[PDB]
Amino acid sequence: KVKQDMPPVGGYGPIDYKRNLPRRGLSGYSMFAVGIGALLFGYWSMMRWNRERRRLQIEDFEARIALMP
């Protein structure tokens, strides 16, 4: 008969050993640019809302002071 030992048609195809750890492109300083940007949004909006809340504050004190007598 023939022999049943293993090796097949040669090569088993290619195999990739070498190291790969790629792909993060979002990082220049521009990460700072987007974060600091987010701050620049927060202070804008929050500024507005605190102004509004002061307006309400004066209005409430007006309620009280009109009550006082």
Partner: protein, 57 residues
């Protein structure tokens, strides 16, 4: 040493405003708008002479 005098009970017992703070708040905003001819005057009264029981009228 000095004896205080307080007005007769009937010097009090004038009128009533009975409402919750809630209604009195916004309604207060509007009358504080249109009223206050008497009561600001009242405030220079009990503020200037200050003796509650002096100005209660």
């Amino acid at each position: 040493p000095g004896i205080v005098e307080l007005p007769s009970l009937e010097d009090l017992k004038v009128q009533e405003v009975k409402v919750s703070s809630s209604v009195l708040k916004a309604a207060a905003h509007h009358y504080g708008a249109q009223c206050d001819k008497p009561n600001k005057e009242f405030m220079l009264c009990r503020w200037e002479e200050k003796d509650p029981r002096r100005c209660l009228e």
